[PDB]
Ligand binder design. Structure first.
Ligand code: G4P
Length: 285
């Protein structure tokens, strides 16, 4: 867990801008389950119009259709979005490809100014737990100081044919200010720090978006006019999470729901629903 505090935030912003000076293209890594909510709130300030590949990681845990709506969003902003599964090695060569496309104009201008062709230089930036070290390791085909006194120095990794990748990610902070965004971040395991309200949010999401699947997963049936407590009760009763007679063990039920959602045990969802976020988008623009 990264402890954020104002000083550490300033140090992170400063350091990431410094790293960005060294590169032609930046890979902004986001969670495919929340392509918009898993972004740093000042990411655009930090990146400052640098050619950008947006990588929607953990696509194996998300909804492709909703993802494709976010990809359209990133395209409309002039970025180059791709989706990958960094852990299981799915769709990876598309990264270099995207970088080539994102820097094409820059290198045409370089070529016209007489310069030789060279390797594209890149780095990865994003909030914690979105898969940055996983992706670096997978691109490097190795596990990226050893002695206690000794600090790691940053190095380039040769990736694919024409790509040089900084071996150290830029780590920035998650969105803090909106309560719903906080619940989404908690539901994806992006942050881990009110759990009952997180479980309520996750339940309501599933009721509204995949009701039959939720029912099938816990093998329950719940009155459509019931309040959310009845879903907690149905789940607790069916799985026998019981306390002091036949009272429902709510903290156990809450924990089970959060686990099942975080680990894609019920289904593969994108919690950022594009059509529902139009106002927040209007605000951020
Ligand atoms: N399903 C899936 N998972 C991914 C993908 N990329 C990363 N992960 C997982 O997400 C977790 C965080 O990845 P990191 O690589 O450490 O993220 P970070 O550097 O940005 O802080 C890791 O799991 P962990 O918490 O360390 O343990 P575990 O869940 O792998 O058991 C990692 O295995 C992906 O594409 N698909």
């Amino acid at each position: 867990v990264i402890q954020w505090y104002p000083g550490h935030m300033a140090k992170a912003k400063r350091e990431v801008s410094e790293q960005l000076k060294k590169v032609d293209v930046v890979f902004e890594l986001v969670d495919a389950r929340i392509p918009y909510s898993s972004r740093n709130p000042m990411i655009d300030e930090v990146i400052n119009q640098k050619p950008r590949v947006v990588i929607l990681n953990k696509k194996d845990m998300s909804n492709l259709n909703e993802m494709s709506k976010w990809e359209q969003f990133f395209i409309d902003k002039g970025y180059y979005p791709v989706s990958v599964d960094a852990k299981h090695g799915k769709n990876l060569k598309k990264v270099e490809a995207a970088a080539i496309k994102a820097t094409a104009e820059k290198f045409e201008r370089e070529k016209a100014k007489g310069l030789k062709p060279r390797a594209i230089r890149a780095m990865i930036v994003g909030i914690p737990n979105v898969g940055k070290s996983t992706l670096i390791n997978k691109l490097a085909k190795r596990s990226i100081g050893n002695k206690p006194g000794v600090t790691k120095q940053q190095q380039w990794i040769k990736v694919g044919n024409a790509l040089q990748l900084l071996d150290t990610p830029g780590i920035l902070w998650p969105k803090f200010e909106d309560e719903e965004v906080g619940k989404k971040l908690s539901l994806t395991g992006a942050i881990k720090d009110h759990l009952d309200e997180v479980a309520i949010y996750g339940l309501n999401f599933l009721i509204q978006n995949d009701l039959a699947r939720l029912k099938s997963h816990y093998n329950i049936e719940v009155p459509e006019d019931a309040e959310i407590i009845a879903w907690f009760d149905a789940i607790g009763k069916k799985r026998g999470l019981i306390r002091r007679g036949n009272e429902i063990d709510y903290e156990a039920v809450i924990e089970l729901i959060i686990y099942d959602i975080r680990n894609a045990k019920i289904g593969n969802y994108c919690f950022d629903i594009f059509k529902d976020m139009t106002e927040e988008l209007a605000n951020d623009a």
